[PDB]
Design a protein around this ligand. Structure first.
Ligand code: HEM
Ligand SMILES: CCCCCC/C=C/CCCCCCCC(=O)O
Length: 405
């Protein structure tokens, strides 16, 4: 069993061994089960063949009880999944993307009044609080100023628990019930008319969604799925720190971004999402027997898809281990060579419905760091570990000497 070794190698567990064996897939005993791990753009296409792979019963329970909730969309298949997947997608169109980005820009500009007056600032902690406040307000979720940091911290505890053992895991195990109870009482009050809601906002839509059979969701399940909107928005803080880390370690692109328009911002945001580690792998079950790449996939066998490795596959990317935003200058867009938030199509599979929100928030945030403030990056540990899942520059990225422009 290599579950310990998985934990020790993190984002490199699959890549190391495909490189070693010179095969795009190998067999391994993980999580007590039998696994096929696989990597590469063609592997991803097989992984998103929804007649060969299912998600029901693929998500480990420890991950359900901390990061994501029990029996949510991640584990649904078939038309039941497509039905609920459209709910999420209705809340993440370009309209909502523009709105979340505008709100973030509004919050960054106000932050300047406080940041100028402070000595240092930890970008990760600022990001968490601003995203939580923005996510709740865009969602219609009441959020008192005094609970903002506490609710954002519970969201990050959930994110940071899925890939952990021991104390780091327990934080997520205790945050998830706090958050589900909070949101569930909102859902109940919304259904009673005791809390004002607004058609088209996330809280309202989750509270009143109807399934195929026309029932509403359990208040707890509505709470769970609303939390699967608020939590990932707060988790964008990881990407926003990696964005600033990129500018610092590759400052040649700061003037490249300054004098360029959104073309350069778009490319930069993409290379951040490609180059830096976030989601290591995805799980699924072979739902019926098949053969691919001279290997037999027996039914009920668990399979991992290597997201990190595919994003650094030299077959798909030139100098993949180097950070080069210029690789996106009017480049063919495939759906399986870059999969940091999944591959395929989001309405025909499990690909992330909030990719657009993730990118526009990143663009607005990047625009704020480049055009709106000057700052120093003082002596600090900027190391991020490929063994910590998720990963983050150790210090949270400290900024000092912040000044308006
Ligand atoms: C911030 C960084 C983010 C990363 C790294 C990320 C990554 C992912 C990945 C890898 C998946 C699963 C792909 C699959 O199962 O095939 C996923 C699914 C999902 N994401 Fe994200 N995502 C992010 C942001 C967001 C945001 C901002 C939202 C909402 C506003 C969101 C909502 C969801 C939902 C609801 C699912 C479940 C999709 C399904 O099972 O059909 N995510 N994400
Ligand atoms: C077989 C083990 C699989 C472990 C990972 C399963 C799924 C991971 C990605 C889910 C992303 C959901 C949206 C973003 C929210 C977040 O990152 O917390």
């Amino acid at each position: 069993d290599n579950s310990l070794t998985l934990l020790k190698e993190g984002y490199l567990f699959i890549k190391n061994r495909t490189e070693r064996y010179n095969s795009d897939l190998f067999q391994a005993r993980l999580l007590g089960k039998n696994f096929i791990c696989m990597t590469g753009a063609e592997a991803a296409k097989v992984f998103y063949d929804t007649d060969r792979f299912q998600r029901q019963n693929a998500l480990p329970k420890r991950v359900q009880k901390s990061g994501f909730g029990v029996n949510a969309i991640f584990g649904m298949d078939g038309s039941a999944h497509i039905h609920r997947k459209m709910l999420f997608l209705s809340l993440m169109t370009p309209p909502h993307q523009k709105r979340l980005a505008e709100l973030m820009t509004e919050e960054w500009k106000a932050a300047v009044t406080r940041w100028e007056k402070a000595d240092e600032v930890v970008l990760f902690e600022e990001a968490k609080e601003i995203l939580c406040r923005v996510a709740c307000y865009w969602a219609g979720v009441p959020l008192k100023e005094t609970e903002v940091k506490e609710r954002a911290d519970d969201f990050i505890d959930m994110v940071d628990a899925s890939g952990a053992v021991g104390p780091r895991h327990w934080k997520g195990r205790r945050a998830r019930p706090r958050a589900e109870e909070w949101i569930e009482v909102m859902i109940e009050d919304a259904r009673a008319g005791l809390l004002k809601t607004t058609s088209g906002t996330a809280l309202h839509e989750m509270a009143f969604h109807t399934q195929e059979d026309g029932s509403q969701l359990d208040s707890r399940m509505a709470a769970i799925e609303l939390i699967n909107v608020l939590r990932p928005i707060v988790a964008i803080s990881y990407f926003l720190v990696f964005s600033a880390l990129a500018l610092h370690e590759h400052p040649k692109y700061k003037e490249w971004l300054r004098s360029g328009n959104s073309r350069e911002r778009e490319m930069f945001v993409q290379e951040v999402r490609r180059y830096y580690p976030f989601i290591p792998f995805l799980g699924a079950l072979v739902k019926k027997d098949f053969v691919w790449n001279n290997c037999e996939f027996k039914k009920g066998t668990s399979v991992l898809l290597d997201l990190y490795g595919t994003n650094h596959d030299p077959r798909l990317w030139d100098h993949p281990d180097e950070f080069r935003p210029e690789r996106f200058a009017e480049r063919e867009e495939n759906l399986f060579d870059m999969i940091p938030q999944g591959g395929g199509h989001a309405e025909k599979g499990h690909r992330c419905p909030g990719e657009g929100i993730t990118i526009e928030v990143m663009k607005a945030s990047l625009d704020f760091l480049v055009h709106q403030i000057e700052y120093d990056v003082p002596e600090q540990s900027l190391h991020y570990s490929l063994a910590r899942m998720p990963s983050l520059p150790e210090s949270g990225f400290v900024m000092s000497g912040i000044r308006r422009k």
